Design a protein around this ligand. Structure first.
Ligand SMILES: CCCCCCCCCCCCCCCCCC(=O)OC[C@H](COP(=O)([O-])OCC[N+](C)(C)C)OC(=O)CCCCCCCCCCCCCCCCC
Ligand SMILES: CCCCCCCCCCCCCCCCCC(=O)OC[C@H](COP(=O)(O)OCCN)OC(=O)CCCCCCCCCCCCCCCCC
Ligand SMILES: NC(=O)C1=CN([C@@H]2O[C@H](COP(=O)(O)OP(=O)(O)OC[C@H]3O[C@@H](n4cnc5c(N)ncnc54)[C@H](OP(=O)(O)O)[C@@H]3O)[C@@H](O)[C@H]2O)C=CC1
Ligand SMILES: *P(=O)(O)OCC(C)(C)[C@H](O)C(=O)NCCC(=O)NCCSC(=O)CCCCCCCCCCCCC
Ligand code: SF4
Lengths: 122, 182, 87, 80, 353
């Protein structure tokens, strides 16, 4: 806020009820900003595709049961959110977040044993 | 079955034209086009305006080329702040990953004809920071480079030698004769 | 004759314009120039330097009133943020 | 009002995370009746916010957990 | 699809799949790589750590190609199509040769037959002399040696010459391609007026230049594409008018075509090509080409055979034409009542400054 546009002072969560509000607050800001993110970096994907990525990022950490670890993830989310909504990231940075735009594909690991073996460890 | 009817006989009348590097000027229309070639190249050499992307300590040696001892202005070199007014990009410094998008952007904003001079070990292949997590291992990963100047830092005279090489490159550039070949 | 046609152009500026208030200021400038041009040409026909003097004071006054009108527009725009009429 | 509900069906029925369509009521809940977990609910309120073109505060959004709660909330807000 | 590729002549290529520094094992020559399509095949090979031989004419034109590969991967060769030594010096080490040399207009130095028929014939003869494994010859849609249109005709004989000298020639027939630096989307989007003597009624199936470049790469990897023929086109048929509708729909500008009649435009098109020194987009055989309508051969391999699904051009107009839509404040649509009301919360002039 005061230092720069989307700056959030680093604070610990008081309890699990406090943490959950921040996590939902963080998700709400992210998926709300998805229309702006598309037109601001000229992303060649629909807001639906972008918003799915937001949920998966939040779902990788759905099973965390440690309060200190949540505070770390919340601070990372605020830092990524600020550097996105401020035009500090470049199209290369945001585009790299979408795993489909790598010339070797998104399925960058072998499907099963025999496809990886026939190609040579993937 | 001789694809087209005269295919077999036509293999003996195929004129073999010389390569541009070993071609000559004979006549008047040829001579005219070399004259414009000389004239247009003399102007490119005579007003050599670099856009100094002075990333680090190589910019100090680059800055010493405009000072009284060497006085690049005596040869027609004027440093330009924006890529719009510039003909040559001198990458003089370590190109970090964080900085590479900016370098590509200013290269894209340079009008043709344009050239890039990589100056210094860092700009050339990464230099002392080749094994760093934050360094591009040579600006030729990002932009095409016309001349590489070695040294960390190259001396002011070494930079001048590279600029002379690029001028000699312009002086041998075929423009009106290249279109005249094809 | 040209001066008459110009007065119509300034007149026609008010007929055709529903929403451009800046065009209203410009159409007054066209009318005033048209009337000053008429005085100048007539002053030439009647060999009268007073016509040229009258035209000089119209240029002075019309220049003075353009500045007042722009200042009034600036005070207006400071509060509204638009010179567009919603119509 | 009733005009809000007919717009409410336009997005919940289009939502792909509903357990079964036509399960929507005038007072249905996202969690108990419609089988929506936490974040799917966050997304539904965000879709309603877009329809009425009014931003919803995070505290107000937490209060909204049912189809009726949203219908009541949008009416109170002047923008629509 | 693996760490081993065995070439037509048997060479085993043990390959380390990766990025810039990896070992692709292939040595490729790409003729006409300095044009619109040559950048996508050269880029695809070099970034896999394959050696790409690039024969060029203008030095300043080929400078962007070097960025694709690691050090020592993109190799430049001075070449003329009438210098045989240069053609076969560029080819004797390669295991695959792409012929992308074409031109839509005749020049003072090259007739359409000189660049296409005689051009291919010198290259294909070099390919057979050194036993190159794969010779992929790029051609045109509607390629037919019985066509009145010299473009289509000279693309027809060159197919027959290539297949005669080198029976395993792979022929690729692309439809007009769109994309970055294309001559379809930007030509419509840029030139103020077009001299089209057919009311833009020629139809075709546009295909992304990216997919053609990717397809060319996929033929290298499968030995089953040799001796085959590939018509390569997009999913849906368009016409120059319908695509112009998309272009206008994206840049907020109105297309204007003069549409002079054929008996008058065609000789004029000849004059302009013989007095102007660049591609004017207008020539005698190009005016004739606009009456023809792309007819797809039914006995030719498609993207299906390569495992690809072309995208429709209307999916790409917004992406490729976004930098051409005006974004000045003067051009936004009128403010909503929501916007009119919020303006009254701000001072709009600094009176203290
Ligand atoms: C004298 C000036 C007129 C000279 C006669 C006309 C020029 C030569 C004839 C046509 C040659 C075309 C060459 C095109 C080419 O090489 O492309 C590169 C470029 C053109 O690039 P281009 O092909 O992209 O041009 C595009 C054309 N438009 C923009 C319309 C699409 O040519 C040049 O750079 C110009 C070089 C020659 C002109 C130099 C003029 C200097 C005159 C100083 C006085 C000289 C007195 C001599 C006595
Ligand atoms: C100083 C005076 C120098 C005079 C030098 C004259 C050099 C021009 C020779 C023109 C010529 O022989 O070629 C004809 C040329 C047509 O250009 P061309 O390359 O055939 O077509 C490419 C795309 N149309 O036509 C031209 O480009 C002529 C351009 C005007 C000259
Ligand atoms: N683009 C399209 O929509 C279509 C293209 N094609 C074919 O696709 C292939 C590639 O197309 P595209 O990349 O767009 O074409 P471009 O015109 O962009 O490039 C053609 C290439 O041919 C080279 N070339 C032309 N004439 C000669 C010559 N006389 N001697 C040596 N080299 C020459 C050019 O080199 P330089 O730059 O030095 O002139 C250039 O690299 C060509 O074979 C073309 O005919 C056919 C159908 C549709
Ligand atoms: P619902 O019951 O479904 O789930 C509620 C929560 C998530 C609280 C779980 O039930 C739960 O108990 N979770 C445990 C604690 C927790 O939520 N962990 C904190 C995670 S915060 C997090 O994951 C932040 C990631 C943000 C990433 C955003 C997208 C990436 C940035 C780039 C955007 C696209 C390019 C511009
Ligand atoms: S090459 Fe040496 S002198 Fe030049 S910028 Fe890098 S470290 Fe500094």
């Amino acid at each position: 806020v005061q230092p720069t546009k989307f700056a959030v002072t680093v604070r610990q969560s008081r309890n699990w009820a406090d943490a959950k509000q921040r996590v939902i607050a963080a998700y709400r800001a992210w998926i709300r900003a998805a229309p702006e993110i598309q037109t601001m970096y000229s992303i060649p994907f629909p807001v639906s595709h972008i918003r799915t990525r937001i949920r998966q990022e939040f779902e990788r950490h759905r099973y965390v049961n440690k309060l200190n670890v949540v505070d770390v993830l919340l601070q990372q989310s605020n830092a990524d959110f600020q550097e996105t909504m401020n035009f500090w990231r470049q199209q290369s940075h945001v585009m790299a977040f979408f795993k489909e735009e790598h010339f070797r594909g998104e399925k960058r690991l072998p499907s099963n044993f025999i496809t990886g073996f026939l190609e040579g460890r993937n | 079955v001789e694809p087209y009817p005269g295919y077999e006989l036509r293999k003996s009348l195929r004129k073999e034209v010389p390569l541009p590097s070993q071609e000559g000027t004979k006549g008047l229309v040829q001579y005219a086009l070399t004259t414009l070639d000389i004239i247009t190249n003399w102007a490119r050499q005579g007003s050599f305006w670099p856009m100094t992307f002075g990333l680090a300590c190589c910019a100090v040696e680059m800055m010493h080329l405009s000072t009284p001892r060497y006085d690049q202005d005596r040869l027609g070199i004027i440093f330009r702040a924006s890529p719009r007014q510039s003909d040559v990009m001198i990458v003089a410094g370590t190109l970090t990953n964080k900085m590479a998008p900016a370098l590509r952007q200013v290269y894209d904003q340079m009008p043709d004809p344009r050239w890039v001079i990589s100056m210094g070990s860092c700009a050339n292949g990464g230099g002392y920071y080749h094994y760093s997590y934050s360094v591009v291992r040579g600006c030729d990963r990002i932009v095409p480079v016309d001349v590489y100047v070695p040294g960390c830092p190259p001396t002011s005279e070494a930079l001048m030698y590279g600029i002379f090489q690029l001028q000699r490159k312009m002086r041998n550039t075929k423009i009106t004769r290249m279109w005249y070949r094809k | 004759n040209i001066t008459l046609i110009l007065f119509l152009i300034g007149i026609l500026g008010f007929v055709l314009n529903r929403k451009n208030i800046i065009l209203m200021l410009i159409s007054i400038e066209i009318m005033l120039l048209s009337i000053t041009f008429l005085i100048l040409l007539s002053s030439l026909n009647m060999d009268d330097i007073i016509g040229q003097t009258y035209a000089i004071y119209i240029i002075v006054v019309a220049g003075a009133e353009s500045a007042i009108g722009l200042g009034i527009l600036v005070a207006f725009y400071r509060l509204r943020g638009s010179i567009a009429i919603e119509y | 009002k009733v005009e809000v509900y007919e717009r409410i069906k336009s997005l919940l029925a289009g939502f792909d995370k509903v357990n079964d369509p036509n399960n929507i009521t005038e007072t249905a809940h996202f969690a108990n009746d419609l089988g929506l977990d936490s974040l799917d609910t966050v997304e539904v309120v965000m879709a309603i916010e877009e329809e009425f073109s009014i931003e919803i505060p995070d505290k107000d959004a937490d209060q909204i957990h049912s189809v009726d709660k949203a219908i009541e909330y949008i009416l109170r807000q002047p923008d629509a | 699809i693996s760490d081993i590729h065995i070439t037509r002549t048997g060479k085993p290529l043990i390959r380390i799949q990766g990025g810039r520094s990896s070992l692709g094992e292939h040595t490729a020559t790409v003729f006409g790589a300095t044009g619109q399509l040559g950048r996508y095949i050269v880029n695809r090979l070099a970034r896999q750590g394959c050696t790409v031989i690039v024969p060029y004419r203008e030095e300043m034109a080929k400078r962007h190609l070097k960025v694709s590969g690691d050090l020592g991967r993109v190799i430049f060769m001075e070449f003329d199509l009438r210098n045989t030594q240069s053609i076969e010096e560029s080819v004797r080490h390669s295991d695959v040769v792409y012929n992308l040399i074409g031109r839509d207009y005749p020049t003072k130095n090259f007739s359409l037959a000189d660049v296409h028929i005689e051009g291919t014939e010198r290259i294909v003869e070099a390919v057979a002399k050194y036993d190159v494994d794969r010779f992929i010859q790029v051609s045109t849609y509607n390629a037919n040696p019985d066509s009145t249109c010299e473009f289509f005709r000279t693309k027809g004989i060159a197919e027959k010459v290539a297949r005669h000298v080198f029976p395993e020639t792979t022929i690729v027939r692309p439809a007009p391609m769109f994309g970055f630096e294309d001559r379809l989307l930007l030509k419509l989007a840029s030139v103020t007026n077009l001299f089209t003597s057919n009311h833009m009624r020629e139809k075709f199936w546009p295909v992304h230049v990216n997919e053609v470049g990717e397809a060319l790469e996929r033929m290298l990897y499968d030995d089953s594409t040799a001796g085959q023929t590939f018509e390569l086109y997009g999913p849906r048929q368009y016409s120059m008018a319908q695509i112009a509708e998309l272009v206008d729909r994206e840049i907020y500008k109105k297309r204007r075509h003069i549409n002079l009649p054929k008996p008058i435009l065609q000789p004029l098109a000849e004059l302009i090509n013989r007095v102007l020194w660049w591609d004017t987009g207008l020539s005698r055989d190009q005016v004739e080409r606009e009456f023809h309508d792309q007819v797809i051969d039914p006995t030719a391999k498609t993207f299906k055979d390569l495992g690809m699904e072309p995208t429709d051009i209307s999916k790409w107009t917004y992406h490729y034409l976004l930098p051409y839509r005006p974004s000045t404040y003067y051009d936004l649509p009128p403010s909503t009542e929501k916007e009119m009301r919020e303006e009254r919360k701000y001072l709009h002039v600094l009176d203290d400054q």
